[model samples]
Target: KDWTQYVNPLMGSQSTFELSTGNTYPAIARPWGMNFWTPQTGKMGDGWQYTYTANKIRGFKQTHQPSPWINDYGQFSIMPIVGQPVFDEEKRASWFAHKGEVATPYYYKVYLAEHDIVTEMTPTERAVLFRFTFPENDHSYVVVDAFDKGSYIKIIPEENKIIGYTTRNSGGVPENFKNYFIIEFDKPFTYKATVENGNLQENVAEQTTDHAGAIIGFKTRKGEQVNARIASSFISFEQAAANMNELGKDNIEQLAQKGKDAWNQVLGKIEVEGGNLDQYRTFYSCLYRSLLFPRKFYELDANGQPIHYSPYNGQVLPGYMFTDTGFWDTFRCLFPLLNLMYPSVNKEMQEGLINTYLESGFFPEWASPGHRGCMVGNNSASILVDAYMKGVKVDDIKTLYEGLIHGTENVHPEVSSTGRLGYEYYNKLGYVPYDVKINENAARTLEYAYDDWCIYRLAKELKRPKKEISLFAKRAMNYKNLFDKESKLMRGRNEDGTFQSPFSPLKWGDAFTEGNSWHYTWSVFHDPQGLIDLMGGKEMFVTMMDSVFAVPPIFDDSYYGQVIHEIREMTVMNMGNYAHGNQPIQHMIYLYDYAGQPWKAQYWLRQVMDRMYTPGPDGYCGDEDNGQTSAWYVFSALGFYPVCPGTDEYVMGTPLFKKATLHFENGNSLVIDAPNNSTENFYIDSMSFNGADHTKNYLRHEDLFKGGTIKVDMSNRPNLNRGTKEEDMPYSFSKELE
Candidate 1:
């Protein structure tokens, strides 16, 4: 498909104070595949690896880093220089042009003006092919650095080969975890130069220390090119060898085409008929970003079977495993999108997560390699339960239940690695008390209750004992224990069951996780009707939604003692009380559908797609958090969203394009037709499913991909009478209770 042309990998790489970006790697890899090759526009360090505006071209690195916040592990980079060899990255980085660069899903190219060299890269599952062209100068050498404290490298000119290993442990990677690699060159090297401890040395066989590397020089005339294939592994050196064998079967153009085809299969899933060029680019770019996360962390064996060295136990295990994702960020949209398009791959992730639970003794909350325990609550439970409810192949569903239940039943002291901080306290008091030593007590209680609801649903589906369902289902409503009637927000209750005094809705990060009352009040996504009842009714819920988006982004910093980035973004962003820059307010706009004002959802949905996203470098409103931010745009642009993911239903919004076709793996296709669609027509005049009126403002998971068409008629004005009746509203728990 020609859809590959719409993917600008560098779309969200620029992060600015005015517009915080996705902080994503302009990743050059297969869809959901392992390994990414990016131009090191910035130096490799503790944080902030790549930026679009940086002029110098640093070495092209083999990276597995997901976010700048989590940092990278098991990585190295290569650079080609023509004149005197410079070891420092700052001194060695060559100036490059923005226009002369090509960034795509599986290919990257940049012209280094300093040495007049062209560097390019493409990838396989676990290997990358790097091709470099030289200038008139004959002294051209390629430098390799591991970007870690401990590493070793050796160049063999006789065999045109280079091999090495690097040990890096960042953000709870396995203890003493090391990455091994092998590189086979298509050309022979004439000589080699080694650098160590800030000094240049003549040909050294091997050296292992901080910042140790060697440069291999080859004989080439002006504009001559040298090529090499690099393979990397988290396991052993022989494993790297096994992954590199594919390069022997294909050449560069053939491999590049294969990578391009892999991307077409994904981008072609959603075909759009009408929109501006910017809309198409932004839509497909976000779609591309959404598929790149939860990157493949497992490698294939010689027999084409999956094998992985478990970071959870430091032992080799059989099966597929994935990392480089945080559940707290991805549970909202990323997993849900995966559920809709790639259910089989979603089941594989569940199996890997269960393996993670068995090895680590707790379901990971935020895992990079092992459990980093970076966020609040056990959201992996959300993914697993969502998968199970969708009838996906999740092996040993009962065993997975036990692992999720363990986290809900017990409290863990290891706050840095795994487990909930106050699971026991929450079970005992129905809330994590405000006076406790733990911060984000209200958010923990709120998120934990949602997780309990997930566990409750999973238990119900498995037909477990009555007490198991009752135990979890009752705890799911604990969110009500922290709701304050006067404040109309989820407040912090002390151990004595009294609300915290001197409450300010504008305060940031005491009872909340990186947000204030306006954001957390909508955290009850599982039971939106119950929350609406807490606010006294649907009209009040609509009023509260208005205030939520209208309230000035003001905050009292005394709670956090300073302004954190989340708060800073919330306060500075012009979106008012709705902090679209973060995940907390992700579902707030969609809540209007549940409140029975579906047209308001259509208005804000258009605003977010039009203003918050674009095709430029500074496009995203916040860190995409792997893919959740971009996934939101994809769904919003597609005209619906999984507001509460554990449920199979999708809350409807306005479609961005005139038409879109979803080609499902089940031989079923869904055509979203908007015949009156245009820029001025933002509101729905009417809607139908297969020529039948779809009055209810929702669609079940099964309703899509069931082989029919959803046609929506658009108008510039809201149809106030369309979905005002009780029967036309979406599902909510309080609606069932009443």
Candidate 2:
């Protein structure tokens, strides 16, 4: 089956700086490829570079942008023109239409209506094959712009090639960082000139300054195809050429077919028997988003060994590396899904994490080519621990463990996100003080507690000293320190152990990150039952969880002094305070399972999936942070979710399809049968696994691998008594110890 057919690469491309559905560009590249290409609609340096509403295509940019907030690095663009060699984006831009544009996980095609040319492209891991079909014209040219911030471009007319490098980055890289690129054209240049800051330098072959570019011109027939193979490397020009050779022996059509086949191989892992066209499309499109990030940063050497240019120290190094991911967002579900379905990929990523620790002193929480200061947390512990717990092996486990310890003990020298901030106070006071200068103190303490739990699990696995492991286990309960029993929510605490005054559960971002206290209170992923205890038993816990969606979408934006996009997304969704648009609260809907209300989880899961997602430009409920949001949909749609990443359990929800089969990496399959499943029939009536009674509200990771059949009955009414037993509960840290 062609799973790629259901994937819409532009599902969430329609967005702006002030609002977002997915805050994503239609990334045209292989799954986890080092380089991705997107059509540029916004001006150069604009974060909103590929808005679906934009009508003009200025160029096709080779981008490494993770999020518009973090921006891009090592990027440039290529454009084809009709008559004169134009350098400025406004002059060279061509009008296009959505009717004429096509996007998929593997390929992209668009007709430049003004130039009477159709552009198509396909990607290899580190290279792209571009096919430009031009109308009959005497002067046809392809312009390459190595964008601003000190760049270089050189035209090799004799070899029909252009070589250059761009030092463009937002942050988190060494001063000497450069992306060396090589573009090899199939057609010769009848006319060629260099460009410097929009000025075409006639008869010049090279330029080395800010915003340098070059134009390679040729004549073409009405149906002539001009092809170019482009590739880039961080090491050197020699490595760039080598990377381009990876696209060898494949024409544009063949390359696109190969990319399509690659996507199918991954997407076909899960097969569904029922669901309307829209449901199938949204499911696969979300799966497509899940596989596109933390891209492979290491390039293969002549000996086929993985090597990379160290973004930390500006030196060529050995072994694997990956970048363009933020642990604060992805550690929740994205890495957990990878650990389950694609452990082979996680094996290499684990090695990459080890290499990063060896190259830099601490593990990077938000790494876009290097350590970037973005969101808050030492959440890398969750990612590494999840991978390690799932049997992913690494060459240096001790070093990786050391990295986690160091992150807990120290803060990043330049960035707060990489390691624990206010660790001194957190270690002494059981939480970061809200009265102090440290911002997002409540968020920091909560995430640190969860991460410490992850560390404790890993330490116990490695047989570390009981004293050390117990210390981490004790820190893991520090979240209880911030619990305000009066409010039944987690609140910020002052240095004197008093709950911070002027507290409002509706307040956004005073001590929390992008969420209010009502949303962030459920962040105790490792132990929801403990949180339930703090709220005064299952009845109160369920009531408070329901209030998350019952309360109106009212918020205090005074902390930011303005309403940020996250607040706007939550307010507009009309789902009350249940802000699925942000990361902190995405799993809040599933908390009903821990409170013995699995039916509530089933009902709300289907509602969010049905209401918040589509297969169009506005496909996401919020910023699809490095596949985390999409992974949420993918997992929940399959009837379960990784509510806690470092654990072996997945909480149960309602399956969206009537029948679904998961092809495991191990020669086994898990088939879920739900014959009466529909939008209205989301409540689970009964369930059985492999012909046995399965009353547990969660599935074990090991049991899923040795797969069988789970036959479930779907009903329009709720099943209040199905999974209410204490033995049916999912993993909770306190319960696990007992």
Candidate 3:
């Protein structure tokens, strides 16, 4: 079946920061492919660059943007116009009918009413193929615009080709960084020239190191179609041209089919047995978004050896590299999904992450070609530890360990991704002091403690130097230093060991990243029991968990001095203080299972699945954050979640499907049968793994990979018996090593 047809690429293209379904683009590109394309409609500032509601398409923008906030790097837009050539983006843009548009993961097409033209695009790893059909016009033109400074274009009119380079500095990327591209046309243009400063400069063979864009002028007979092969490179123009050979004449249709084949294989990995068409579309679309990020940043050499230019040190390096991901968002779910389903891709990603550390000295926290220093936490450490512990080794374990330890011990102010900001204070006080340390101090302290525990886990597994293990093991408990035992909430403390004054559980973003105290209080996932103990016990843990969901979803602007979008999103959720829009509380729904109430966890999981997610423009409840949000849905539908990544265990939940088959990369598979599964049946009466009664609230990584049968008995009324036993509880930080 052509499963790609079910994907509505435009589902989240209409979203913005203020109104986000996913903050996504109707990006038509191969999974993990370098370049994707989006139709530009809105103005540049508001950043709804491709709103589905808009009727006009400014350009078919070749984009490298992960989100609207991250923006694009080293990209240009192409606008096909008729009758006359207009240099300006506003004047050149044409109105397009949305109903006539087709948007799939592999292809996109729309009818431009203003020009009586049909525009379409498909993509490869490093290149894109664009098609434009125009009615008879003497001045049918295509405008190629470099969206930034230090951009240059050269027109080879006789050969019907164009080459250009654009310097980039998106977010924190270096100013010297440049991207090169080659545009080869199937049809020769009768006339071509440069357009800059509102003048069409004819006879300009080349315009080097100028911001002016290129315009290709040609006469098209009625219904005549023109095709262009556009390829890009970070190495050099020669390499960019080399990338163009990856596609050829009549290859557009072939590549589109190829894209569909690839998507169908992945999307069809887990076949949904019983669900509405809309539910199936939403589920598959979420799965689609999960694979789009941590994009392919490495280019292959002549011998097919992976090579890439290091944006960190501005030097070429051997091996693989990836960018356009923030671990703060992806670590909770997306990485774990990759670990389970696509372990081979996970291995290459691990190698790429190691390459990042080798080039930059610190692992990247947020990368768009290079570190953007966007979010808090040394989350790269968590991802590294998680992958290694799961036996997906990325070479250079020793150096990786050293780098991980170095971050915990020192502050790398130059490259924030490598080290903690309050390393000195954390070392002395065992916690980050809000007044003394930098922003998001409480969050930093809490996250570092978790990562420290992760480092200890990896080191102990490798039996590394004892001091490295002991030291990190102790620092892993530092999260306790920030917890106020009296209030049962993780609060920011002053240097004098006093809690920050005038605290509100609902307040957002004074000490947390895109969250509040109610959300961050449960940030201690690695030590769930230790946190449960701090919350007083399972009884209090249950009460506080209930309170977490029941609290009024109000927020403060005092932190940033103005209400940010995150605050607005949380207040609007109506799920009490649960900010499902962000990553902080993603694991909260599963806390009940860990707290010894699997039935409670099951109901809430189904609630989130049935309520927050749907098919259409408002498809997501939050910013998809690359794929983490969608990954949450994908795993929830499968009846489990990796609450603590880097470990072998997955916290179990109620399965939504009547039957699910998880195909393993190693040719093994698991058949999950949910007996009596339906919309009304939200509780798991009991579960048997491999034909044996499985009482545990979580399953180990080995069991999932080994592959077996899991039969779940469901009921509308809570079973209320299973998981109530003491031994069936989850692994917690308080559980000492055996």
Candidate 4:
């Protein structure tokens, strides 16, 4: 099936600075492509670059923006204009409406109402092909913008070419970082001009300035099509040309077809059936989101070997490299999904992490081409451990293990988020102390504890010394220390062995990242039973879990001194403190299974999947955070989720379709058959694996890879007795240790 047709790249584009649906732009790029092209609506350097509400497109931008908060780097734009050339972005902008715009994973088509031109584009891994259909005009021009912060442009009118490099960045880049680009046109320029800070220099072939560009004009007949092939490389201008050469002689149409084929290859890996068009669209659109990052940061050399400009050191290096991802969000599910279905790709990403460690001396926690100071925690451990535990072929596990140890013990010299922030406290006190001035201490402690569990597993797998493995294993249980017996939540503690005064579960962001104690309390991903014990056993665990959703969506924003977008998103959801908009509490609903309340997990999982997701511009509940949220839906719709990544188990949810098949890379397939499934019939009544009468509430990784039919009987009423047995519950560290 042509799965790309089911994907809408604009599913989460409807957003603003105050409120966000998905906080995403229409990224028209090949799966994991280096450069993604988006129709730029906002002015140059604006973080909200392509909101759907914006009616004007200033230019088609080459963007490497991971999140709007982190903004973009190594970016420039190309604007197609008619009649007189307008160097200013706002003055040359053309109106566009959603009705005339078409966006897919592989292709983008939009009509510029003011210019009366139809622009179409398709992406290769390292290059893009643009086809512009122009109206009859004496002058039709294309502008190549090498954006501000020291740039250079050269126009070769005789060769129908333009070359430039942009040094524009939003921090976290080496001093010499630049995106070298080459644009090749099929037709010669009739008239030419160079632009310096919006001023045109007619007949000028080259310019070097802070903001530099060149306008190449042509006389076009009615419906004349102008084709331009554009590509970029971080290494150098020569490498950019080599990247463009990969496009070959393929025209726009052929390139679009190849792009579509590329998308279908990955999207087809999981073919779903017995769902409405909207459901299928939402699933694939989210699947598309899950594949967009971490982007491929390396370009192939002339000899077809992978080479890249090391964002860490500003030197050309031979190896795979990936960027534009924050491991804090993606470690929950995105990488897990990759570890399961696309191990080959995850294998390469793991190798890339090894390269990042070698070049940077530390693994990147939030990397946009390099180590970025964004989110917290040393989650590179989770990413590495999950892939290695899943049997992904990582040739240098020893080096990765060494880097993992280094990351936990030492903080990054520049980016604090890349390594453990409160390493001294965490190592000595088993938690990051609140009174010691380390921000987001409780959240960091919880995450570090889980990451410690991952390291423990990785150490054992690598046959490390018993003392070393035992140290990480002991650190893994550090989450237990933060549990406040009175409040039945994770609380911030001072270095003096006392809980922080004047606590409120409703308060956001004191010792937490973006959430409150109510959210971070459930972050003990490796062992829910340990938390359940801390909360006075299973009965209390069920009550606390229920209280999270039953309570009103009230919050105290005094810590931030304002109701942030995350806080607003939570208040409007009406699901109380269950902030599905964020990642901290996403796995909380699945914890109901640990308390022998699998039906509760089933009910809430269905509600979240159906209510929080859709197939539209406002398709997401909150920031998609580079596909972790989307991967959540994809996993939930498939009747399971990787609540913990290093573990092989996937806790069950009710299937949202009648039938869905997962084609594993090992030539095997797992078919989930949920006959009579519908929105109303979202509760699982019974299930069997290959007719063996399976009752476990979790599926092992081996079972999924081995491939068989999982027949799930769906109904409107929940099966309260099913999956209640102690053995049926998913793995918990306490139980495993016991």
User: How many clashes in each candidate?
Assistant: 0, 0, 3, 0
- Cα lDDT tens digits, model 3, 67-156, are 788777877778889876787878887787778888888878888888898988888788888889889989898888765566788899
lDDT of 3 at 359: 80
Candidate 1 residue lDDT tens string, 322-383? 88788889989899999998887777788888888777788777777777757686677788
| Candidate 1 root-mean-square deviation in Å | 1.6
**Predicted candidate 2 versus true structure: per-residue lDDT over 1-738, tens digit per residue:** 788999988888888767889999999989999999999998988888899999899999999999888999999999999987788889999999989999887889999999999999998899999999999999898989899999999999889999999988999999899999999888888998999988888769899998899988888999899899999999999999899987987998899999999899999998987999998999999998999889999999999999999988888999999999999999999999899888899888989988888888888899998998888988999999999888887878879888889999899889878789899999999899999999899999999999999999999999999998999999999999999989999999999999999889899997999999998999999999999999899999998988888988999999899888899898988888999999999888788988889999998889899999988999887999999999999999998989998889999999999999998889899999999988789999999999899999999999999999999999999988999999999988978665
Question: What is candidate 2's local distance difference test score?
Answer: 0.91
Question: What lDDT does candidate 3 reach at residue 434?
Answer: 82
What clash pairs does model 3 have?
386-646, 527-733, 648-701
> Could you estimate the TM-score for every candidate?
0.97, 0.99, 0.98, 0.99
Q: Cα deviation of 39 in candidate 3 (Å)?
A: 1.4
Q: Write the per-residue lDDT of candidate 4 for residues 130-232, one digit (tens) a residue.
A: 9999999998998888999899999897789999999999998998989999999998898899999888999988899989999988899999999999999
Alpha-carbon shift of residue 555 in model 1 (angstroms) = 1.8
RMSD of each: 1.6, 1.0, 1.5, 1.0
lDDT comparing candidate 4 with the true structure: 0.91
